[PDB]
Amino acid sequence: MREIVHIQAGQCGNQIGAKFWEVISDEHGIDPTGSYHGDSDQLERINVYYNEATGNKYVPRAILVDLEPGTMDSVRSGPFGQIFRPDNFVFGQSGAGNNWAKGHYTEGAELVDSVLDVVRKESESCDCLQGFQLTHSLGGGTGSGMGTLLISKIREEYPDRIMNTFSVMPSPKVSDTVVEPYNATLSVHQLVENTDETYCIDNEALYDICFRTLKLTTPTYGDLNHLVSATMSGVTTCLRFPGQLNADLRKLAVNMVPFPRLHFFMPGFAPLTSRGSQTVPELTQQMFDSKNMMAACDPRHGRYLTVAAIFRGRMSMKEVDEQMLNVQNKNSSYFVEWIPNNVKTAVCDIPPGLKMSATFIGNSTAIQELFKRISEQFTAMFRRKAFLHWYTGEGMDEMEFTEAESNMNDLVSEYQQYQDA
Amino acid sequence: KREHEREVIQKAIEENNNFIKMAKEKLAQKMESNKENREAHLAAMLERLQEKDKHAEEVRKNKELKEEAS
Amino acid sequence: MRECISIHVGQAGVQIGNACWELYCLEHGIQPDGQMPSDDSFNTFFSETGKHVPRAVFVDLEPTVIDEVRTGTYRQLFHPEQLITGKEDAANNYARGHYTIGKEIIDLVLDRIRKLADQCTGLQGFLVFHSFGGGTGSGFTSLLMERLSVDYGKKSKLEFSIYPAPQVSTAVVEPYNSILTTHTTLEHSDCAFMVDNEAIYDICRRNLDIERPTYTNLNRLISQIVSSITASLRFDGALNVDLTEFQTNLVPYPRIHFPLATYAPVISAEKAYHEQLSVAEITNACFEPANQMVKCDPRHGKYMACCLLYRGDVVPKDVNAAIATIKTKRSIQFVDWCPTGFKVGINYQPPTVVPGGDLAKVQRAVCMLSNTTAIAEAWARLDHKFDLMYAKRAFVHWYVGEGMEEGEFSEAREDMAALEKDYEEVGVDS
Amino acid sequence: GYTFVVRDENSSVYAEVSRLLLATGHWKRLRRDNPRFNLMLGERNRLPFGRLGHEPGLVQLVNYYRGADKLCRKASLVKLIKTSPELAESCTWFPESYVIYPTTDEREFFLASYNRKKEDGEGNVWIAKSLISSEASELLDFIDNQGQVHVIQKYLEHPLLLEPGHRKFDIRSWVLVDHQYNIYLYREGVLRTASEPYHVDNFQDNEMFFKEFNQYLTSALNITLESSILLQIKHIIRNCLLSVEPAISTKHLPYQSFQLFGFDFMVDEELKVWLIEVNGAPACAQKLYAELCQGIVDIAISSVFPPPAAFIKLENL
């Protein structure tokens, strides 16, 4: 078997992580008690995310981490709270106060070893571990600081495995603390070096989707998390169901990442919204549209290095192939010519939910617009050394901020270099 | 002519055996040099990660110094 | 007494192997349990116990695909030791298949192969089936070929290589794996039959009216062509000519060992019409680009060899008349250093089709094996795709990360450049 | 949208064609080795025809027909005339030629024909091209003292001479064969004339257009350009391109082809047109560049990629 160890850290990481498990548990016919009550053959690759326990129960191979019990107490009480392994809940009492330094260096360093003990236990019970997937935000303190700390420690212990993350980028439109650009820049510096593939889930894009198009005056985190779970379900489809394209984390990485640092994907989904709601050519045009991207970037402002499209539900494969060829050729300028056949397509018979949907995973050079936005916000504060005392007070030095800013600016210039190639 | 008949068959043996010999040595050299390269890539990766831990210990210590001189 | 061991590597090699052995069983009246009520020439491919067991080995670095063989209709056909699986696949990476994961399973494979060789009174050689694009198909195969040249020095090694096609491609790095495997295997392969998935795909869409062909559709058509090529080894007759005799004519230079295969007729099982199809009709189809296993233009390529392998109701008189008509009417140009003649072989055993298949049952069929410089177009397409990516070093880090060096990339590419030049030189007049 | 590549900067004809495509607003020019093109204005030698039409969804067209050099190279044209079933017995318009190899090889057949002509007192002047002589011993030695394959063609000793001046000339006709194989003869031709009087002993030795040539023919011979020369030219072009049609047709190929040819003719004193050579990459006359290049854009390019009376479509009867 090819197992994935899932880790969720912090408020955001645990909230989106809990939704991801509710969504895929439904898709795989697993109820909150861990028992199977589905049809088809769900179950063929259930071991990728689920352990088999006594009494034919399927237990999510998930590790729940946080420096505050609050969000953890919410999970364990909500739906699918009793599905998780109680031993895998690892929490502290003194939170992180939305401070990266606290999560990465002080508060988090005190809790990290006990998390690694659970990671190790879950790994030792793997026939063949493919790697890990971490759900977290980059704007807070636990998911951002302690999450990147966990990634670093796991990589040291498992350097030959794939490290995948679903990283929620911060936005002023959906913010809680002014120091989010500091936390995000510091985390991106870590992700650039220690992850093989990152799904950039932008809160700015999720907000604009809920507000413009969806027409939600005041979107809540629940409204944003609906988009995330629909995306997370989609981008993980090839890993959970029998398929040929990107069947595992390594094959996905080999197809999606041409350059080690340029591993930040721009997800897409179609059609937009469920949360109480109601053709192949229509699915294709939407999933490629800027308005359906989960990262606030205009793909027409850059070029696609690689793309992975996934269609779900019963539909004409001939029509899918025609439509995918039509989006390319009509927009051939937005796909790098030096990477032949860089758009791959997969189709899954089992739909999410909906009768038929589409999910887009793209490695576009336009992703630099996300890193530019953060870099601009980081510089506006760092220039005036605003709130630095909260980070320097934890042991950090200003030089560390200058290095993270510089590494992210280098990342942007690298994405621009390949856009001009 | 018998002399040449023996030189032909011995030449064929010497060439096939020498080909089998070279291929064996080049394959073992490739698998060995590959092992060295892959292990070096992992060693440098871990060295970078270790330098990061040494820096975290130095940050925790740098806080310990500021708290006492407060 | 000349046995032939088949080795099926990776998903493509295994799935194609399943189709070939299913066909061979139908052709020889062998049931899925190995029993053969009719019961020799077929002993080149099958050992006896009254169970007839394929002289084949199935290898894959991942168990799903071979596990289907282990639990499928033909589970009883093979001996468990012939089906070898690992735990972790090569992730479409030549370096993982050849080095990282290949090293871990190679010795076990060579042992299982040795067990088959030990049951041979006069082993003729091996037939290796694999894809160019997969990590196992490309990487592990070249490692296997390297080791086989050591352990079996003289023995012949033929290939059936699945050439990558975007319509069914599963990896962006298939061009890399293709050049790397071709380079490494070149000295160790005596003859290789490339099967362009795009060509088989287009034949299925045109001749069989299949909107979106699947691997099952492709593999059943591939198995027919493979069957025609190996028919001379599994049957015998006065007009049957052995494949190694064709191979002497097919390979003028060690490096130029890639014959183009063309097959006829490919008729839909429902749109059969009941037409018989003369010897003259199918022979003419061999020169229609629409029926080739590799996409290229033989009209603009010089021939170094041409072999015709007939399978059903065929008598020499008809063959000679059909060849006479084809001459002085077709763009058949030979190199000035080769006799402009056709080597013909006839097997009176008519072609077999899988019951409930897409192919119609015919009274006669022909497979042409020709060594034409036109096949170099397939190398040009692959080498160009390699050049586009390699210029930017895209994806190279995945290979370097597994211990490979940029040097192997340029060394393999330089060898491909030399191969393209060799095909150019062999076409120039003396 | 439509994109095109230019892989031959030396081609004067397709440099003007490139400018015309860029003027429309419908065409964008990509870099030399960009494989995601619609039209390819390829190179003269070693054009990558195998890589064409394989990128999925793209409609690709090339300015050359793969093959065609079998009609353009001197030795291959001689081979085609003598061996094609469509030409071997019917060809009365190609001067008696023999392919001579210096280092297959019709040397013995040339000497038999040369000896037949000197015995009967017939004209025995021959021209060797990769030397004009009536000796054959010095003609053969000329070939052997060069590392190239030459062709010994019968020299036209009685050509049609232009008056005044009493001078030799040859006709160049431009033929455009589009995809689907429609042969178009460009209305305007050129006469590459000599500016020295013709001599039948001195072996040691300027663009007239069809209006001036038509005016010379009546009054000079009281006959028009057509019915005496233009019908012969059209017949030769039709026969030549259709003999190679099955070997070069792109109907069963993933890409489409088109080509501009340069047919070279020589008229004898009995007003008989003789084909001398065919050019795969011809050069146009300065004043005919604008009209010819526009015709290539409309007939061959705009027919495949859509956004008068100057090209006669050659058909049989």
Ligand SMILES: Nc1nc2c(ncn2[C@@H]2O[C@H](COP(=O)(O)OP(=O)(O)OP(=O)(O)O)[C@@H](O)[C@H]2O)c(=O)[nH]1
């Ligand atoms: N005709 C045909 N092509 C196949 C088949 N399976 C895979 N392919 C082709 O083979 C290439 C991929 O190689 P695979 O055989 O899937 O890979 P593998 O050898 O298992 O290698 P890894 O999975 O990377 O360990 C692509 O070009 C596929 O289109 C099959 O059953 N038939």
Ligand SMILES: Nc1ncnc2c1ncn2[C@@H]1O[C@H](COP(=O)(O)OP(=O)(O)CP(=O)(O)O)[C@@H](O)[C@H]1O
């Ligand atoms: N048989 C012949 N009779 C008369 N003039 C001839 C001739 N062959 C060639 N010429 C002249 O010599 C010139 C040589 O031109 P070039 O060397 O480009 O080839 P060509 O058109 O003569 C080729 P071919 O070998 O088919 O005759 C011609 O343009 C023509 O004026």
Ligand SMILES: Nc1nc2c(ncn2[C@@H]2O[C@H](COP(=O)(O)OP(=O)(O)O)[C@@H](O)[C@H]2O)c(=O)[nH]1
């Ligand atoms: N999409 C989404 N964003 C969230 C959620 N919870 C918090 N955030 C974002 O996460 C950041 C705050 O960090 P958080 O994860 O709450 O705290 P931590 O425990 O310190 O990691 C901000 O950018 C918030 O917008 C959630 O459930 N969904």
Ligand SMILES: [Mg+2]
């Ligand atoms: Mg496989």
